[PDB]
Assembly symmetry: C4
Homo-oligomer: 192 residues x 4
C-alpha cells in the first residue's frame, strides 16, 4: 500500500521490511495580499524596467524575467511564471468570491529545492511577491508547504532522498513512495 516496487536482474531475492516516515514535498509559496480580482493589475503604474527573479532547483538556478504593467495581475503573473520555465509552477487558488491567491510551487521536490522571489523596480509588487530568508508582516508572500525529503528505512537502514522515486538505494530496485507506513507497522516485501 505505501509503495510500488519495480526490479531488474540485479535485485537480490530475499526478505525485506520497509518503513516510510516522510514523503518528499515541493515547497509552495502563496500570496497573502487581499486580491478581489485575479485580473486586476497589482503593480505600480508606468514601470518600464520591472523584473521578477526566481531562484529554484538544485543546484539553485536564477531566472530573471521582465514584466510589463499589464503582467502584474495574478493571472498574468501566473502565465509569465509558467512560461519562464524557472523551476517552479504557478496556479491561482480561488479561496472564495473576491478572494484569490497565487501559489508558486517548486517543479522539483526535496529539502534543498527551495525558492526565492525578488521583484526589481516595483516595491508595491515586491510587497506581494518577494520571498527570501526573512519575513516581516502578515501580507507578504508566505511558505504554505515546506520543502522536504523522502525518509524511509529498508531492512532497518534509514535512507533520505529528494524524490519519491528511489532508484539508487538498493541495486536492481526502485521504490516509488505513495504514503507513509503506519507508526509501528513496517511493510513486508519479498523479492523472488
Amino acid at each position: 500500500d505505501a509503495f510500488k516496487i519495480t526490479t531488474n536482474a540485479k535485485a537480490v531475492p530475499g526478505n525485506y521490511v520497509v518503513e516510510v516516515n516522510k514523503l518528499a514535498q515541493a515547497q509552495t509559496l502563496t500570496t497573502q495580499a487581499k486580491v478581489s480580482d485575479q485580473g486586476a493589475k497589482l503593480g505600480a503604474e508606468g514601470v518600464t524596467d520591472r523584473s521578477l527573479t526566481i531562484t529554484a532547483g538544485n543546484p539553485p538556478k536564477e531566472t530573471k524575467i521582465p514584466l510589463s504593467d499589464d503582467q502584474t495581475s495574478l493571472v498574468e503573473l501566473r502565465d509569465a511564471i509558467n512560461g519562464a520555465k524557472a523551476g517552479v509552477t504557478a496556479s491561482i487558488m480561488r479561496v472564495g468570491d473576491n478572494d484569490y491567491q497565487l501559489a508558486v510551487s517548486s517543479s522539483t521536490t526535496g529539502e534543498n529545492n527551495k525558492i526565492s522571489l525578488q521583484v526589481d523596480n516595483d516595491d508595491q509588487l515586491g510587497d506581494i511577491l518577494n520571498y527570501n530568508a526573512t519575513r516581516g508582516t502578515g501580507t507578504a508572500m508566505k511558505q504554505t508547504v515546506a520543502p522536504q525529503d523522502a525518509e524511509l528505512t529498508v531492512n532497518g537502514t534509514a535512507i533520505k532522498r529528494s524524490t519519491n522515486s528511489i532508484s539508487d538505494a538498493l541495486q536492481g530496485v526502485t521504490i516509488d513512495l505513495k504514503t507513509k507506513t503506519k507508526t509501528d507497522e513496517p511493510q513486508h516485501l519479498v523479492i523472488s
Copy 2:
C-alpha cells in the same frame, strides 16, 4: 484514497499536496416521540387547516403544505414531505419492533443549508415535528446530523465549500471528496 480528481486543459501541471479536514454534511432532524406503529395517525382529530412549513436550502426557501388527518402518520408524513420537493428528503428508521422514527435530511449539504419545520393548527403534531432555534424537552424533533461544510487544504491554503465536489477552487480541477486524510498525512497529487 481521500479524493478523486478530474482536470481540463486549464489545469497547471505541477506538484500538489492535499489535506481533507471535514466533509460537507446534510443536516438531519429525527423525530424522538415514541411511535410503535408507522401507520398510526399522530395528529389531532378533525383539523381542516393543518399545514407543515419547511424552510430549507441556501438561500432559504419556505414550502407550506397542507396535511389531512390521514396524512399525520409517519408513513404519510414521509410521503407528503418527499412529494413536496421542499429541499429535504424523508425516510423512516425502524429502530426496533414497535419503535419508529422519521428522519428529515437536507437535500443539499453545507453549514448554511439548515432546516426549520413548523406545524400550523395542530399542537399535538407540532410537539413531534416542530424544529427551530430552541428546543425544550426530550421528545421534540432533534438534530441528529449537523450541517457542515467541506474543509480542505490545497498546497497549504485552506478552502471551505458547501459541497464535496470542489470545482471552483483550482482552475481546471475538480476535487471530489471521499474521506478525510489521516491527521499528519497530506495526500500527494501530480498533475501532468
Copy 3:
C-alpha cells in the same frame, strides 16, 4: 469501505452518513485442558449413558446427543457436535505440537445467541467441556470470543442488530457490515 449497500424501489434518494461502532460476533467457547493428542479418548471408561447437551440459538434450543467412549476424543467430539446441527460449529485449533484445543462457535451471531454445554454421566469429560454461568478454575471450558450485536448509526440514529446484514432498519436498504468506521469519521452514502 465499512459496508456494502443494496437497495430496492422503496429506498429514498438522499444524503446519509453512517457510523459502524461494533460488528455482530458469534460467541466461541474453547477447551483449555492440556490435550497432546486430538485422537486420544478424554472421557471416563465404560460409560453407556453419556450425553452432551448443547443450548444455543435465539430463542435458545437444547440439543442432547449421546456419546460413546470412542467419541470422547477432540476429533470425535468435533464430528459429533457438527453432525448434531445444534446451533454451533466445532473446529480444532492446533496450538502447537502436542497442544490441541476444541473451539465451539455459535452458528448465529448476536448478544443473545449464547451457548451452554453440559455433559451427563461423565464428570471427567464434564471438567473439559461444561460451560454455564459460572467458572471455577483455569482448565475448564472458557469463552474466547464474546457474543455481540452489531451497533451502527444511520444519520445519527443508533441501531442494534444480532447480525451484520441489516435489512430491517431503513426501508428499501440493506447495509452489510464489513468493518467499523474510523473514530471521528462517519462514512457518506448517497442514494439516487
Copy 4:
C-alpha cells in the same frame, strides 16, 4: 485486508474472528563501518586461509566459506555470501554517495532463525562482519531488523508461528498474513 485465506474439504463452515498482532520477520544484520567504495577491498593484505562462517536457519546450520583478498570488498562479499546458499541473502544499501552498507538477511523468518557471522584469519574484516551474542562498539556489524514470529488469534486463541503462511493451526485452512489488524478491530471470516 490483513490476510488471505485458502481452504480445502477439511475446513469447518462457521463464524471466525481473527486478530493479527505481529508478522514474522527475517533478522537482518547490516555493516556499520564507513565504506566509501563498494568495490574496495576491506580485508587485510596477503591472507591465504581467510574464511567466513555463517550460522543460520532452524535448526542452526554452519556454512564456512573461503575468501581470497579480492573477495573482501562489499560487492564480492555479497556475491560470495549469496553463492554460498548459507541460509541468508546479502544486498548492498547505497545510503548516499560514498556511503555503502552490506545487509545480510535470514532466508527464513522467525524468532529462532537468527544469524551469527565469524571471520577467521582476518581481524580487520572481522571488525566489519563479525556478529554474535555481544557487541562492543559503534562500527561493528549491527542488527537492524529483529527476528520475530507471527502472532495471531483465531476465535480468541493465540497462535505463534515462524512464518506468515499459517497452514498448521486450523484444519483445512491456510492463513497467509499480510498486515496487522487494527488495535481493537478483529477481522471477520465466514467459511461456507
